[PDB]
Amino acid sequence: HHHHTHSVETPYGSVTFTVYGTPKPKRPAIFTYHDVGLNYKSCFQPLFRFGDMQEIIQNFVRVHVDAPGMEEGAPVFPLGYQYPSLDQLADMIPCILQYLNFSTIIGVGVGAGAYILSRYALNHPDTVEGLVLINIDPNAKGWMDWAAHKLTGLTSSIPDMILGHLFSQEELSGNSELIQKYRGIIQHAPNLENIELYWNSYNNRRDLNFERGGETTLKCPVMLVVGDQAPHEDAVVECNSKLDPTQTSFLKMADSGGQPQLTQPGKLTEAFKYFLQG
Template identity: 25%
Template sequence: MEMTEMHVRPDLPTISFVGLPPGAEPGFNQNVLSHGTSGVLEEYEIVTPSGIPLRVYRQPSDSKSAILTYHDIGTNHTSFFGFFSYPEMRVISQHFTIYHVCAPGHHEGEEPLIPNRTNGENLGFLKSVFNWHSGSAADAETALLPADQMPAAASGRHRGSTGSGSFSVFGRQSVYQNVAEESTSPTSQINQYPTMDELAEMLTSVVDYFKLKCFVGFGMGAGSNVLARFALHHPEKVSALFLINPNGTTHGYYEWFRNRWSDLPSLQRGIFTDNLLDQLEAHWFGFGCCQNEDLVAFYNQLARSLNPVNLAGYIDAYINRTDLGLVRSPDPPGVVKQRESEAGPDAAGPPTEIKVDCCLVTGSLAQDLSRALADLNGRMNPRTTQFLLVPDCNGFLMEEDPDKLALDFFHFLRNVGFLIMMTPEKLRKEAAALQKATAEVAHQYLPSSAFKVEQEA
């Protein structure tokens, strides 16, 4: 019998994308994609009080419970799509509305948030690094400003500044200029990428816009730090935190001299170097060795697809982050609550404890990430914090072992009061049924032995 190969072209429905109407100005809380044409994701642009637009991608559901994700440096919201498309996570997602928050300027096709000066006027990053011993922090900060904006005395708001003075973390200054305090209108020019604290405070606009009572935070790397800062100051808005590769300290000497980030000024000019990719890989994998070349190539391509100026801003904000200021109290909870009640709500001093349930996760092969997790876990409340080292994994747990991570996330949600009626056996059964249904649909449109489903007798 002669076999002939047939290529069947499925008759797929037409998909149309609807953007902003002609002549409309971007931003101002407009729904960028029509809800009717985007069955999986709804894209929103929310302008924060600082004037910086923030993109949020929502996976709608009938549930009022919410999961809010925040991505790492060198990636964007799409880094969560693969993990949340995993069968077990698809079952879990049916009980939540997912909000993927994209860091400012990190969505596809975005323009630079700040002026891109190619003549080196605001590229004093390396100069301030290597000349930190030759002058004061105020001199280094003044050196970053153009001649026409040189103040009579170095002052203003800066990362790590306290009061009217300012200081630099290990002598390093931001590659961006300072933002005037009065520049809060949406039409004002943005001169500096937000700090980590400002990125965390922007989430209040997301919570208010979608009228979220509280949410479960799901962060990765630098996004874990942003969510931890938000929960530290707004615990009433957070139900729980699931933080992958978290870090609660500053960018220390060891981390600085190992990472270097020497090509960051070039990235701010729009030049993406191979050395910078190596630095990002070291951050992602915690200096572990990733054997999956396809995974490395995918995230390298994702990093190159981002706007380099905005990517440099997020990296700069992360390496100039401040310490979370967490302190583990040796006293029992009753004594701590009594002390807080006696001090009153107007007690001076920043918060020193994240008062929500947290799960800290990283891979056992990522030595630096494991060290950072151990340090953060030692400063958290042991009654509300648990940690997990996934064996035989580096920093990219969502791709390296999604089955294990999804099951751990499921157990964590059950511990904090979600999915009480679902057992692990029921989760696997529903995931298998969902996977089978997906295979049947794929076989219908793409006839192939790879998607063939066994017929029950």
């Protein structure tokens, strides 16, 4: 698993990205963006290093983004630091791609990462050959979503609420080895204060429109993924109703829970194969 790690300076701060494999003339880069509370390794290593996935992605160059302050070893931003909005995080992507001189990507995002890459694709559609969107929720919180959030926050800590964004309450109750591991990752994150600022940016996101005036806005192939009964199911189901069905696939996974790329890498690998196959 040899790689090389870079960053770029942008008007909204520095962002880190890690490159595996080598670029090739025909082919897009697989470009990933992780969810709140994770980084590229805790979000994507279990999938990307799954043996059957290694086979599928070996000949692609992979560019794995760590959002600002989420990279391994990140300093904790001083309290008061104004963290980029999700839109601003999407606006850093052209800098990364310009630095690498990679003109085309297949974006793979989870949660907030899926929003960010969707925003990027709307901004620069001629650079995106497809998107894999896990747990995408493109809607801003309304008054009532804020009400629910704030009420929950009376009895839940920030880390509790981030774990509830990532996993179903049923999973969190069941103390599987995975959940125990990820509880520790989030609760005890040395950069938890940074993670919280990314959480806030996610919660404050504006509407991202996959349709306008009843017409779909995204023009690339999209593979939607969510767990059945998982926190973001209704949002992903709604996205599926707004995208062009001739260019869209939707895996609602029966037994995946909130982070399907962590629990069902075998099933997701076969999905990835058919998404990338020529």
